[PDB]
Design a protein around this ligand. Sequence first.
Ligand SMILES: [K+]
Ligand SMILES: [K+]
Ligand SMILES: [K+]
Ligand SMILES: [K+]
Ligand SMILES: [K+]
Ligand SMILES: [K+]
Ligand SMILES: [K+]
Ligand SMILES: [Mg+2]
Ligand SMILES: [Mg+2]
Ligand SMILES: [Mg+2]
Ligand SMILES: [Mg+2]
Ligand SMILES: [Mg+2]
Ligand SMILES: [Mg+2]
Ligand SMILES: [Mg+2]
Ligand SMILES: [Mg+2]
Ligand SMILES: [Mg+2]
Ligand SMILES: [Mg+2]
Ligand SMILES: [Mg+2]
Ligand SMILES: [Mg+2]
Ligand SMILES: [Mg+2]
Ligand SMILES: [Mg+2]
Ligand SMILES: [Mg+2]
Ligand SMILES: [Mg+2]
Ligand SMILES: [Mg+2]
Ligand SMILES: [Mg+2]
Ligand SMILES: [Mg+2]
Ligand SMILES: [Mg+2]
Ligand SMILES: [Mg+2]
Ligand SMILES: [Mg+2]
Ligand SMILES: [Mg+2]
Lengths: 208, 66, 117, 132
Amino acid sequence: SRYSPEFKDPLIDKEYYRKPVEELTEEEKYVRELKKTQLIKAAPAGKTSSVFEDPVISKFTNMMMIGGNKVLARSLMIQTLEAVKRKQFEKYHAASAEEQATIERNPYTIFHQALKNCEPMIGLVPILKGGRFYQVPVPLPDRRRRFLAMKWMITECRDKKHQRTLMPEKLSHKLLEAFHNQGPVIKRKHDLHKMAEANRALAHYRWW
Amino acid sequence: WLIKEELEEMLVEKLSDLDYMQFIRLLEKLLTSQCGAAEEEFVQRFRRSVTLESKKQLIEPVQYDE
Amino acid sequence: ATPSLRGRLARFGNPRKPVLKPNKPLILANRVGERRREKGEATCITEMSVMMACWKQNEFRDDACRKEIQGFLDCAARAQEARKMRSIQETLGESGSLLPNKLNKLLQRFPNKPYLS
Amino acid sequence: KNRAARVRVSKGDKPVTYEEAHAPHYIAHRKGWLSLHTGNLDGEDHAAERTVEDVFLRKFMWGTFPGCLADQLVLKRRGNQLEICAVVLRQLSPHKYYFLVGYSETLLSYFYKCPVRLHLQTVPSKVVYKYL
RNA sequence: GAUUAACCCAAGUCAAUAGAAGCCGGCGUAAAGAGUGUUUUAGAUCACCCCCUCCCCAAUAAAGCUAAAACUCACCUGAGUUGUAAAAAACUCCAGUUGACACAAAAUAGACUACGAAAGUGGCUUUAACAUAUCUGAACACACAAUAGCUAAGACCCAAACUGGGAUUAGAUACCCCACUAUGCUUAGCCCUAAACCUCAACAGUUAAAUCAACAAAACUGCUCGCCAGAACACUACGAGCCACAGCUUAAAACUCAAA
RNA sequence: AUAUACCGCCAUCUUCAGCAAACCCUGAUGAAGGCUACAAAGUAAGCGCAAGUACCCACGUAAAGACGUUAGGUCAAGGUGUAGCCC
Ligand SMILES: [K+]
Ligand SMILES: [K+]
Ligand SMILES: [K+]
Ligand SMILES: [K+]
Ligand SMILES: [K+]
Ligand SMILES: [K+]
Ligand SMILES: [K+]
Ligand SMILES: [Mg+2]
Ligand SMILES: [Mg+2]
Ligand SMILES: [Mg+2]
Ligand SMILES: [Mg+2]
Ligand SMILES: [Mg+2]
Ligand SMILES: [Mg+2]
Ligand SMILES: [Mg+2]
Ligand SMILES: [Mg+2]
Ligand SMILES: [Mg+2]
Ligand SMILES: [Mg+2]
Ligand SMILES: [Mg+2]
Ligand SMILES: [Mg+2]
Ligand SMILES: [Mg+2]
Ligand SMILES: [Mg+2]
Ligand SMILES: [Mg+2]
Ligand SMILES: [Mg+2]
Ligand SMILES: [Mg+2]
Ligand SMILES: [Mg+2]
Ligand SMILES: [Mg+2]
Ligand SMILES: [Mg+2]
Ligand SMILES: [Mg+2]
Ligand SMILES: [Mg+2]
Ligand SMILES: [Mg+2]
């Protein structure tokens, strides 16, 4: 890194700075007076202080980027969000007054919930015991759970099973399926739970 | 506190790393005590100024056009 | 009380057959052994089996196992923070008996003297 | 391990001069060049010809003042002048130095068709920078 | 090898052979304290003086006894039990609970350190019983001597050479799993071996001097018996003795090497 | 011909931190060994690391990287010992 260890990461949050002084504790007062003497890295060109910023969608976009082509990756993302919203507006106008109350039309709410429905609770990690590796079911950290949900969704959309279907139409279709606890990405989560439940006998190999 | 290489110049002798720690541990023990003026000029002989450059941003002048 | 060593070893003047055959001289070393790294017990394994039990009866549908999944999640987080604190307290504080490194420094100052000076 | 122009450590009895004591990566950092001309500047010509001349002058002087040179030559070019600065010892009689100066300057002037001058600085012994 | 020069001896030179030249040193690990004790003919001065560990604890022989755990049988119950890094084979009159029930073996005590000549001896009781008022004293005399083994007659839970089956492996005459026999036990006779080593002989004495190659379990003195003298051949051959007949004890040489 | 005679220039450990003259001490003055900071026999020039320097910083990247290891590579860069060829 071209930053020395003395550089601290920037905090990009308008609310954090407009907070009155009276509400601050003696510990939060120390951190604010400390940062006035520290070196701060330049804010990356990715995140800003915008009110439409979504760190989860930004991360999903980078995981779709091929060869640093962010423009194309970002283009596929907004086309998916538009495709999801148009499908929900079409399902909304074609529904009855009672069914309309249960139809979600916010693509950001659908995207977050669809990924949350695909996150696995437990995984298989190799543990060495007696000179052999055993696939031991273990709890996954929050980072790993969220990462696996995104990776499974992107991998499913790149599968060759889809013939000539463009990414925004494929992804929008998979998100709405996962949003309703259906589709192949939900099935992949169930398989990891079934394969972790089969190795239930090896769970005691864990030591944390 | 002055570094070992600076102490090796005030003394004009070669010091070990552990020799330097022992001397610093003994000066710190002298500050915690109720040291007087005579005991304060002595400790300052071994304190070097660690000037901290201000991180305050420099403001550009406000100009006026035609 | 330490067991006796009188007449236990094969020596001149000791008529009886030896009681002990130490493969190392019975002389205190100037150091103690290093504490072995221990393997802890798995945490939340009880909540893990309760969660995987509802899955078997509900066709692995998370919607029906929310309370069991949540319990297994909360336990994992609590077991994570406790694991994070066990290091700061037990490894650094040296609670109870001293650590081998500190205890060996104390033996350095009072070495066993099996010879004359 | 790198070898180029490195006097390797010994038992502490090998005297080395300042130039011999610095490896190639110190050129332009702690030691200068032994020849100065414009041939290697951007947009300049005849670098190949200046190089051959330098190599010859160093061999010529080495064999013309045998056992006298106490250091490498410094070759300087200004216009069409050629200045040769050499550090020599004080073993040969002055008469022989004056003969060799008059002889070498004249011979080199006719060989390379330019006014050549030789500047001699005498030392009682080889200047030692360190003992490797 | 020739040649040049030099060195030694010299009317000799020196190749082969032979002879001269050798026990007061050792024995924990280099060769050597030979499994144990006793005595003889003798030897020693450690025997009179002059003295402090008798009895008891897991010596030995005989007779009797049995707490835990097995085996077997019976009732009830189950449909499997065994095997493990993992399998197969094996059993399925099998397994679990309960009760009855040894010619086998002796948790804890024992962190004790005792007994016996050594080998050995650690469940309980009883009987008999553990030589010598100087010391040393044997491959062979005299009497003993773990385990394995032999002969004969019994017992048999468990273990188990061999053998059979299963598995592994390039092969597996093994290591792993199962089964079962000789054998381990008793009785009566043999056999006489061990890293029978605490590799340190018995008795008497010392802790000062030079403390002492190394390591091991500090270094020595007196006295006696036993034993040793390069390696290998060789726990062998031959002879002799022996209840031993593919055995044990005693035990060489030739050829070979310049080391071990 | 010989890289197994070599100079020259390098690979490699090295994405290392060690190398070492001259001394001193310990082991009965043997081959050998030499530290404990509430310190117990080590002192050490020099070399390397480090520091400095280049590039856009004090960061990073370059460069640097000893003694030795593989008789490592190159007699076909050039030079060269030894041996060989000279219608
Ligand atoms: K003759
Ligand atoms: K018992
Ligand atoms: K024997
Ligand atoms: K033994
Ligand atoms: K070379
Ligand atoms: K060459
Ligand atoms: K050559
Ligand atoms: Mg031993
Ligand atoms: Mg390199
Ligand atoms: Mg021997
Ligand atoms: Mg016991
Ligand atoms: Mg006797
Ligand atoms: Mg005899
Ligand atoms: Mg015998
Ligand atoms: Mg017997
Ligand atoms: Mg028998
Ligand atoms: Mg059996
Ligand atoms: Mg039988
Ligand atoms: Mg019996
Ligand atoms: Mg024995
Ligand atoms: Mg005797
Ligand atoms: Mg012999
Ligand atoms: Mg034998
Ligand atoms: Mg025989
Ligand atoms: Mg015979
Ligand atoms: Mg080479
Ligand atoms: Mg830098
Ligand atoms: Mg580099
Ligand atoms: Mg550097
Ligand atoms: Mg080679």
